[PDB]
Design a protein around this ligand. Sequence first.
Ligand SMILES: O=P(O)(O)O[C@H]1[C@H](OP(=O)(O)O)[C@@H](OP(=O)(O)O)[C@H](OP(=O)(O)O)[C@@H](OP(=O)(O)O)[C@H]1OP(=O)(O)O
Lengths: 424, 137, 140, 67, 103
Amino acid sequence: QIESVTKETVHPRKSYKMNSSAADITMESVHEWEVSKPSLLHETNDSFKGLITNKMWFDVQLRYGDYDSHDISRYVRAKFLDYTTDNVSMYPSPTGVMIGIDLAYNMYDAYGNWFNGLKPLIQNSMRTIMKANPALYVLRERIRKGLQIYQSSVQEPFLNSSNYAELFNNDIKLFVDDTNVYRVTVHKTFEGNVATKAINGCIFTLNPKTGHLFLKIIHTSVWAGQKRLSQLAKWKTAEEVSALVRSLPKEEQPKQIIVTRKAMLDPLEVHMLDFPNIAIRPTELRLPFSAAMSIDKLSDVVMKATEPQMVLFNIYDDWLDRISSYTAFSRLTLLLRALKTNEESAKMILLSDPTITIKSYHLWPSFTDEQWITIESQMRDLILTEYGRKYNVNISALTQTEIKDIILGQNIKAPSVKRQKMAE
Amino acid sequence: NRPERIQEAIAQDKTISVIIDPSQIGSTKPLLSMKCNLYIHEILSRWKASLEAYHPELFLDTKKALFPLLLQLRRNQLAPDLLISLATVLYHLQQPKEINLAVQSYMKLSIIDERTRLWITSIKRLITFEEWYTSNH
Amino acid sequence: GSKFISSSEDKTVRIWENQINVPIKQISDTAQHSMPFLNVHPSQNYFCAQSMDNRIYSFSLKPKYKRHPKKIFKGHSSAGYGISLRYICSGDSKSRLFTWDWNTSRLLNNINKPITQVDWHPQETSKVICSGAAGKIYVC
Amino acid sequence: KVMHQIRACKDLKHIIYYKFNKNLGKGPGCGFWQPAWRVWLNFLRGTIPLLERYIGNLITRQFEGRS
Amino acid sequence: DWDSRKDRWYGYSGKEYNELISKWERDKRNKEIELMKLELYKDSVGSTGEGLKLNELNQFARSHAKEMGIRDEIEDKEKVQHVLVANPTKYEYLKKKREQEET
RNA sequence: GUAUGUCUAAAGUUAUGCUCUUAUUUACUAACAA
Ligand SMILES: O=P(O)(O)O[C@H]1[C@H](OP(=O)(O)O)[C@@H](OP(=O)(O)O)[C@H](OP(=O)(O)O)[C@@H](OP(=O)(O)O)[C@H]1OP(=O)(O)O
């Protein structure tokens, strides 16, 4: 029987401010509630006095304990009847609830007044959150990293060459690459040493189903603010992505977000804490999207960019019209692959015929399906050629293995590959 | 009192050209506002037909998200920086061959922000439906 | 039409693409530059430019990344300007104009009368304009 | 060197409390701030010269340049 | 047991907190026109998946491969026919026209 | 990545043998990637 669950917006300070506390949630009731006298969560015998409330409040109270202050219940109680009974930072009601989380010990507890039949919900809630809040899990994982004891255990397997099929499955997705966010003009200096200067870049933000390549064009102005830009690249990337996700609706909020650079996952996890439903997918299979930006019109647009702007495109248009998305994506994958091997070769292949013309909207030249097929074959040969040159063993390839080689994703050490192989 | 607010408004609701001039953005205000405000009402009505085909659950709250705009637009509470970006989205949304330009314009609109997100996000559903609506037709 | 060059007061030259706004090449430091002019070079490889230190340079503008000067045109006490067609003709600060064989960097030194902004009548083969200070334009 | 003062205060607390809590149990509710207060006064007495010199020189530097 | 001894509040009924409620319970005892309508005139007046079809096509990749060049050929078939299965977009048509013949 | 050091931050002081095309090395440098 709650009329409205409103969040009282406090300063960012509140989170960690300890001398005072404004209430985080304010709870407007339908009827008067008759809350119990203040008590702890596990204190079962909650005494229902004649006092009533038309409005409660919920406060969180994060703490980081020591070997000496490692009980939370006492602390939370103290906090509750400190801030209530203190003439700074008054709550709308003196009757309310206060949760506190010992982050150092994972010892949740809460104290305060209790609406009838509420306590069980809160207990269960806390139990759930502690079991798996995203933010708290991140924190534990962060600490774990700090202590180099990280048990490499994932619930969802990575995108290897086998699971590539099950990438997409009538399911709204998004795909991210942060490779060409921080590009540099290397130019000489008066002293003689090199000076790196930032160029405009991108946030390769693709959707394999629709073929809608979003890419927020990074204007160099955003680097002009700060230094240590390789890390900052990641941060801006994840920030931008997060913002984009926020902008889109709950239906069009993409479920599984895939990331090219596995290092850039780490801050994304943080900026994805805005919304927990958006699962992260660290790809085992490296896809060529550094060379994605070396497509003519894309690079053109990147250079053109004058400000913080995004200019989306359909990475494949005609292909969608002809065939399902997956087919289109295979072709695209081949193309990008070839580009990554060699740009000149790629362009040559594309512009082998000069009679063909790239459509005004489209990023790619519109071919007939048999000539298209031929082109694809040529590209594949290019990739294989590259492999032969560098890897020096492109001749005696098994089928699955060959497929992996095309992507260049299925690594030899990757145990997923062993799995698929084992299966066959 | 309230009856003449029904009469004058519903009469005015059926009295408009559902058009956005791409050059009148440069001019200074209620004309572009109410053009867009009642163009959105057509985007609402085209939805109202194929509510059985499309998923209706999100629209029921889309309505409540749109209610701010209605209150903004007929008053001109909505800011010039928002409005120029907003009308730019709706103009490109008119032509079926500006679907790139539609979401293009929406992304540059999005890029204090609590219900503004909610309604601006709701506008993306209006593009999402309209883009699909013209496809499945 | 595509590539675009612009030297500056800090003694640096910048090959750019038409609109890319990203330096294809910043030039070397210990020189100085003032006036940028492309020689009407038959291959059209060459971007010439006058200095502060009395010496007009030459640059292999194709590719833009190339910039090794072949032979430098010394002997024109510079505060001014210079233009090409075979020959490069540039004026000096103090006295007078200087025709130079573009191949060997040496030719006649015609009197001006000071100032110096030289140019060629390109529709013809041999006719120059000098730009003297205070209504003294000399033609050849 | 204020550690001495701090240490002294600690000692006083230890002394005081255990003359203050003979039959009385444990807890925080003892007052009696006299001897500690005395300690702090004497510390201030000690330091008043030191701070007159120190802050003297400081503000002199702020005003007159350093020598 | 440190934080128990520190516990500024310890060993108490809420005698001070009941006095706060008493102080505030006393304080309890002591205490659009057209636009609403203009907007609400419109209706509101309340106030695996497709990758399985790839997985079938990749299973059809097993068919053309099982026909020609599985293991015996090093490069001549198992690499050449490898280049001509699964990778290129044309393999959509190879299955599609086999579906069209099957229809 | 830094110490550190320069730079900008707007108002007008009253005078008449070579050019060329390239491919290769080596060195140094590079908070750019591996
Ligand atoms: O001996 P110290 O390190 O100065 O710490 C003392 C001491 O606590 P420990 O014995 O745990 O160290 C006192 O405990 P008792 O020896 O008296 O049992 C306690 O005095 P109370 O028992 O009277 O509280 C006092 O605590 P407080 O400062 O609250 O009086 C506390 O000092 P710290 O709290 O600064 O450690």
